[PDB]
Amino acid sequence: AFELPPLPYAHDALQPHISKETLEFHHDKHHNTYVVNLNNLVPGTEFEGKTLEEIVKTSSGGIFNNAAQVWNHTFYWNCLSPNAGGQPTGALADAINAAFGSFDKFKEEFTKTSVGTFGSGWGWLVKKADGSLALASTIGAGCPLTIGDTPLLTCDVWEHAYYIDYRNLRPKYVEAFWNLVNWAFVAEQFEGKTYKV
Amino acid sequence: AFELPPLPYAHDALQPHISKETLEFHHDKHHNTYVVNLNNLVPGTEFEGKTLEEIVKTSSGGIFNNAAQVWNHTFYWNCLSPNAGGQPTGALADAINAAFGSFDKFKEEFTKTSVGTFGSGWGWLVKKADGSLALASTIGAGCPLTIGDTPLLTCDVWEHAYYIDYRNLRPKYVEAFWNLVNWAFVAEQFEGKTYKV
Ligand SMILES: [Fe+3]
Numbered sequence: 001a002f003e004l005p006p007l008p009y010a011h012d013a014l015q016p017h018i019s020k021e022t023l024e025f026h027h028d029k030h031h032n033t034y035v036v037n038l039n040n041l042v043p044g045t046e047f048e049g050k051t052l053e054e055i056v057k058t059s060s061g062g063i064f065n066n067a068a069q070v071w072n073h074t075f076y077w078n079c080l081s082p083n084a085g086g087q088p089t090g091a092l093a094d095a096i097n098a099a100f101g102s103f104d105k106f107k108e109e110f111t112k113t114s115v116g117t118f119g120s121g122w123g124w125l126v127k128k129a130d131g132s133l134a135l136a137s138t139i140g141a142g143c144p145l146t147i148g149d150t151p152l153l154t155c156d157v158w159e160h161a162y163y164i165d166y167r168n169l170r171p172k173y174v175e176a177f178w179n180l181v182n183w184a185f186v187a188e189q190f191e192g193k194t195y196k197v
Numbered sequence: 198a199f200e201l202p203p204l205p206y207a208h209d210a211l212q213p214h215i216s217k218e219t220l221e222f223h224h225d226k227h228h229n230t231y232v233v234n235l236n237n238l239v240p241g242t243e244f245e246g247k248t249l250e251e252i253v254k255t256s257s258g259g260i261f262n263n264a265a266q267v268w269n270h271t272f273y274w275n276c277l278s279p280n281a282g283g284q285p286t287g288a289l290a291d292a293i294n295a296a297f298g299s300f301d302k303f304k305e306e307f308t309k310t311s312v313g314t315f316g317s318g319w320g321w322l323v324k325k326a327d328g329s330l331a332l333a334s335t336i337g338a339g340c341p342l343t344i345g346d347t348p349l350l351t352c353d354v355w356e357h358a359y360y361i362d363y364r365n366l367r368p369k370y371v372e373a374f375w376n377l378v379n380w381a382f383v384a385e386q387f388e389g390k391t392y393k394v
Contacts, residue, residue: 029365065315118262119337119355120316140316158316159356160365168226168357 001039002052004032005074013082017176022164027077030160034069041066053196056143068141072122075195076154081182088183092152092190099133111174113137114155123174125153127190152189153181198236199249201229202271202394210279214373219361224274227357231266238263249394253340265338269319272392273351278379285380289349289387296330308371310334311352320371322350324387349386350378 007027012020038055041063042048047055052074055067087103088096100106106125113135114123121139126149128134133152136144144151155177162173189195204224209217235252238260239245244252249271252264284300285293297303303322310332311320318336323346325331330349333341341348352374359370386392 025364033365119318160360163357163360167222168230 038066085179123155277377282376320352
């Protein structure tokens with residue numbers, strides 16, 4: 001059955017941008033719940049052998065909400081890391097600077113897309129089927145995988161992602177998340193070995 | 198312009214079911230923000246003279262999300278109170294026991310409807326146009342007023358309504374909310390002077 005992927009870093013590794021408490025709750029409880037619920041939902045269905053990506057790509061209803069949320073969260077943890085942040089270099093940086101004009105202007109628009117997500121949702125930086133870059137905002141457990149797009153970066157805006165550390169100040173959370181982005185991971189997604197399982 | 202209604206009780210009046218901190222944030226900040234945004238949104242539009250209820254009933258988009266969230270919150274604060282909880286008596290109790298079988302089974306189903314709201318939303322107990330009782334779950338700022346139904350009771354399940362006190366334990370929040378319900382207010386809505394502003 002599906003399993004909860006260990007955190008790619010220590011629980012206190014992302015301080016002081018995201019507390020250890022936030023990670024314990026967000027990863028140990030919330031993420032875990034989605035995993036548990038997915039494992040209770042797949043038995044006896046046509047999703048019994050499929051892979052996470054496979055399920056979120058063909059499922060709907062409650063199976064989807066949980067499957068997509070598990071993936072979204074695993075992907076999300078990888079988009080972050082200690083001693084990171086900064087900017088992307090190489091082809092990624094060119095794709096961004098060419099699609100958004102500059103990295104600072106990409107952050108501006110990525111921030112607007114995230115913060116402007118009404119309610120529970122996610123902010124995304126994706127690569128379309130034509131290799132072009134694009135921003136997307138999903139609500140709930142919405143995942144770019146279902147539109148054939150390729151996720152390069154994501155930002156969880158569900159209130160539990162930041163309430164402990166920023167309360168209602170969602171913008172201050174997004175701003176501090178920039179200091180944790182794992183551009184190496186984003187780059188890998190951009191063009192190379194895309195994240196799976 | 199629209200104003201933020203004072204809390205019907207002290208900020209620490211609902212302890213220990215809902216902390217004073219939760220009320221200061223939920224009411225003083227979140228509730229207030231929806232008010233402030235509504236006031237920036239209505240000027241120059243066709244909602245310039247209307248009432249809160251009028252706006253949430255004929256608006257859409259961002260004007261709606263803010264108008265309905267202001268209403269939902271004001272209504273919500275009234276559905277709670279110190280030295281309350283218990284059960285409804287009279288005609289309300291009859292309508293409940295007749296629609297749900299018993300008050301305990303109504304709580305079961307109301308709880309299921311609330312907790313089962315995926316993401317940000319609200320749990321409701323309404324009275325349809327044919328006087329029958331019904332449960333509803335809205336996402337985001339969804340309000341039963343727009344369906345011509347009559348809200349009797351509501352439970353905010355946006356994570357900010359309980360994260361400070363229960364974190365991811367939404368169920369323990371709903372369970373503690375029952376100890377705060379102001380049934381007199383719910384009764385008023387059931388049949389009589391319905392809430393205004
Ligand atoms: Fe709220």
